[PDB]
Amino acid sequence: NSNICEVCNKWGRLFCCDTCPRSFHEHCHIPSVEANKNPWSCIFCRIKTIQERCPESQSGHQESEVLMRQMLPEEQLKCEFLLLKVYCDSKSCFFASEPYYNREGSQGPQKPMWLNKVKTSLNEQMYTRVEGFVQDMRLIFHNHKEFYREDKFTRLGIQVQDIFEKNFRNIFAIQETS
Numbered sequence: 001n002s003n004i005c006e007v008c009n010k011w012g013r014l015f016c017c018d019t020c021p022r023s024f025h026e027h028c029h030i031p032s033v034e035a036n037k038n039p040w041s042c043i044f045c046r047i048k049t050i051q052e053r054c055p056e057s058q059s060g061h062q063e064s065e066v067l068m069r070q071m072l073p074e075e076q077l078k079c080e081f082l083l084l085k086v087y088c089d090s091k092s093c094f095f096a097s098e099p100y101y102n103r104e105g106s107q108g109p110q111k112p113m114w115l116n117k118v119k120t121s122l123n124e125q126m127y128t129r130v131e132g133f134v135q136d137m138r139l140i141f142h143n144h145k146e147f148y149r150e151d152k153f154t155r156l157g158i159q160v161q162d163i164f165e166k167n168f169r170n171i172f173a174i175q176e177t178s
């Protein structure tokens with residue numbers, strides 16, 4: 001197994017996947033690494049099994065159909081994995097915890113949102129459809145763009161949104177377009 005956490009790239013108290021070489025901190029894995037379960041398979045492994053059991057699940061889809069899906073177990077898992085793919089980028093630090101807003105010439109967003117809030121909301125089964133999760137995720141970056149205005153710090157929102165959107169298109173097999 002690897003000697004660093006796949007998500008945050010630091011060593012520490014790591015849990016090792018039995019079916020691949022990845023390792024994780026307890027709360028870096030999503031869902032949090034399960035108490036028992038020997039062998040244990042990580043989220044990467046679980047996502048790979050879905051594709052292998054239904055090869056046609058990789059044929060292109062329309063975003064509008066994906067968003068209306070109900071959060072059954074497989075969609076729950078895919079959203080967890082997409083969330084984890086964001087936390088894998090070190091720039092997710094800026095969006096992880098609850099923000100506050102006090103900048104001359106700007107007003108805070110009407111609906112603040114952050115990664116740890118989305119994490120909790122997944123954990124507590126608060127999304128009934130994929131659309132709920134994706135709207136909250138895109139809201140994080142949209143709030144950041146609006147607040148920061150012409151400050152060059154706005155670019156951090158563009159960068160992490162790009163990671164989100166590439167991974168969304170990959171995980172949910174969105175039809176490729178020009």
Ligand SMILES: [Zn+2]
Binds near residue numbers: 005006007009024028
């Ligand atoms: Zn970690």
Ligand SMILES: [Zn+2]
Binds near residue numbers: 044
């Ligand atoms: Zn694994």
Ligand SMILES: [Zn+2]
Binds near residue numbers: 055056
């Ligand atoms: Zn099949």
